[PDB]
């Protein structure tokens, strides 16, 4: 059984780490919501 | 139940102690998440119950108490925050610019930070603090490492 906790407020917040790359993926989505990736 | 906007946790006790199976957002009294983080059963706030209303495994959604409201869109320019909720640490804001997912249905956004599996529904948002969308289902790339999908759906 299944219960939810407030963790915080919806918010932008100036000078947040600041990090990951931005890759352009070519992917395929599936009937049970999976995506995969086309090469 | 607690129906105050914000970014929530979501837990079971089925499993040794309590253990985070994900996240997600309340807005406007309704309570958004993916929907393989609670296979489409039932919620509890406090002694109040919180019901499905609208779900599809395919999108990878589910909303509680009413219609999906969160309709913001990534503008395909500009830098996102993952409002990342992990099991056990506080929410933190991960600045990142998005990837993009190329689909014989068109581009969708995408991001390429890695957290627990019990991160999926963080909130990404724009610089006005809307939720363009959530953090949880996406691809593991020739590295090793996650890239996950901004799944938005729609308002009616
Ligand atoms: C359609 C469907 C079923 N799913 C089941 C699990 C996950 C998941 O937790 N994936 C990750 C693995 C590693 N790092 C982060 C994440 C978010 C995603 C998913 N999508």
Redesign the interface.
Known sequence: ?????????????KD??????????????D???D???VE | ??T???????????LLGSTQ?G?????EGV?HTM??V?KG?????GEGR?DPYWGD????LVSYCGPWKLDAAWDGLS?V?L?A?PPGER???????????????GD?G????DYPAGTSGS?I?????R?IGLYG???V?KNGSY?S?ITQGKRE
Request: aromatic share 6%.
């Open positions: 059984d299944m219960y939810i906790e407030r963790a915080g407020d919806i918010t932008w917040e947040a780490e600041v990090t990951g790359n931005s890759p352009r993926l070519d992917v395929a989505l009937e049970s919501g995506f995969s990736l | 139940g607690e105050t906007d914000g970014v929530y946790r979501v837990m079971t006790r089925r199976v996240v997600g957002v309340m807005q309570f929907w393989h609670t059963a039932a919620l509890r706030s919180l495994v395919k999108q990878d830098e925050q409002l909720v929410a933190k804001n991960i600045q990142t610019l998005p990837g993009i997912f190329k689909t014989k249905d969708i995408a991001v390429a930070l909130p948002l724009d610089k006005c603090g939720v289902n996406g691809v790339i890239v999908a």
